[model samples]
Target: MTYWICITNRENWEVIKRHNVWGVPKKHKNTLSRVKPGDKLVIYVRQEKDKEGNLLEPKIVGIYEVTSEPYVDFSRIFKPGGKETYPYRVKIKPIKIGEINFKPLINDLKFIKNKKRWSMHFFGKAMRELPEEDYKLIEKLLL
Candidate 1:
């Protein structure tokens, strides 16, 4: 089954760093190693609020999967000028739990300088102001 994690008052980077999560360089590999081809990892960040009902720490969400293995030739996609020479693609099979289908969400490594930083950019989805019900649904999955 896919694992869903929740953090009350923290940012995405804090969760990744605190848990010693893994991403790019093969040095400190921990979180990613536990993921398998059909495994899904979902993270939810809680937002800060003001007395006026203004939400500060907008919701940051990401969906990712572990591939069979790392990409072999990155150069084929990355150009010498530090731009994408071709469409970045990967072959992945989806895993279904309940009614949700989880797929690998790959992002360009060059977008974020630090591999340890896990932000919404990784999923290419906008920082969608999620509703309370959305968070509740995620929590139910975790339980």
Candidate 2:
């Protein structure tokens, strides 16, 4: 089965957990288009600061299984501000929900070819394909 890494902020991640859905902007349609039912999604939460401005580390939060083909919805969900709605949508089921630090696993993650420029792997993209080996490694820590 194909595996994908879906990156989002804590707020949106919460929305995903509550709604059992994943949505992206129009520009991200091409990538989301390839997603299919039965595929697995590894949810990644990016780093964020707390109320006191302390930097929290990025984390691999959970794993989910896609349950439907990609669709569209204009309804507001994620608290991303503005009128922008992530219309490209798909239904998913939570398989495993847990927390695991992402930085420590970087050195062992094969998808990240450049160790030093590792952030590039996740930068600017909402989601990307994950090699089976890397998925296995992360799944081990998560489970």
Candidate 3:
């Protein structure tokens, strides 16, 4: 099965937990179309702070299995900014739900070509394909 890294902020990650869905903006339709039932998705929550002011590290929050093909939904479960509602979507079911600190594990991931500026690999991307080796490494830590 294909593997992907699904990126989101802490707030939107909560929404995903509530709805069991994953999505991206209209521009991501082509990439989203590649998703199919039974694929694996790694839920990556970007660095952020909590309401109480504690810094939350970027993390591999969980892994999920795609249960449906991509579709459009404007119901607004994810954080919307201006005209972006993350409408391109897919249904997902959790395979494992837990945290594995992401930054510390960056060097071990093969997909990040530039190890020094590894965060750039994820810049502006809501979802990207993940190497199976990297997925397996994360699964070992999170599962």
Top-lDDT candidate index: 2
Q: Pick the candidate with the highest TM-score.
A: 2
Q: Which segments of candidate 1 are over 4 A away from where they belong?
A: 2-27, 43-58, 70-136, 139-143
Q: Write the per-residue lDDT of candidate 2 for residues 38-71, one digit (tens) a residue.
A: 9999999999998999998999999999999999
- Tell me the whole-model lDDT of each prediction, alpha carbons only: 0.35, 0.93, 0.90
Candidate 2 TM-score, true structure as reference: 0.97
TM-score for every candidate vs. truth?
0.28, 0.97, 0.93
Residue-level lDDT of model 3, residues 11-101, one tens digit each, is: 8889899899998987778989999999999999888898899998898889999999988878866675276788889999999999988
Worst 10 residues of 3 by lDDT: 76-85
TM-score of model number 1? 0.28
Output the lDDT of residue 93, model 2.
100
Q: Write the per-residue lDDT of candidate 1 for residues 1-143, one digit (tens) a residue.
A: 33423222344334343432323223312333344554444444444677899866534344434355423223332212344322222233323222221121112223334545545433433122223444345435434
So what's the TM-score on candidate 3? 0.93
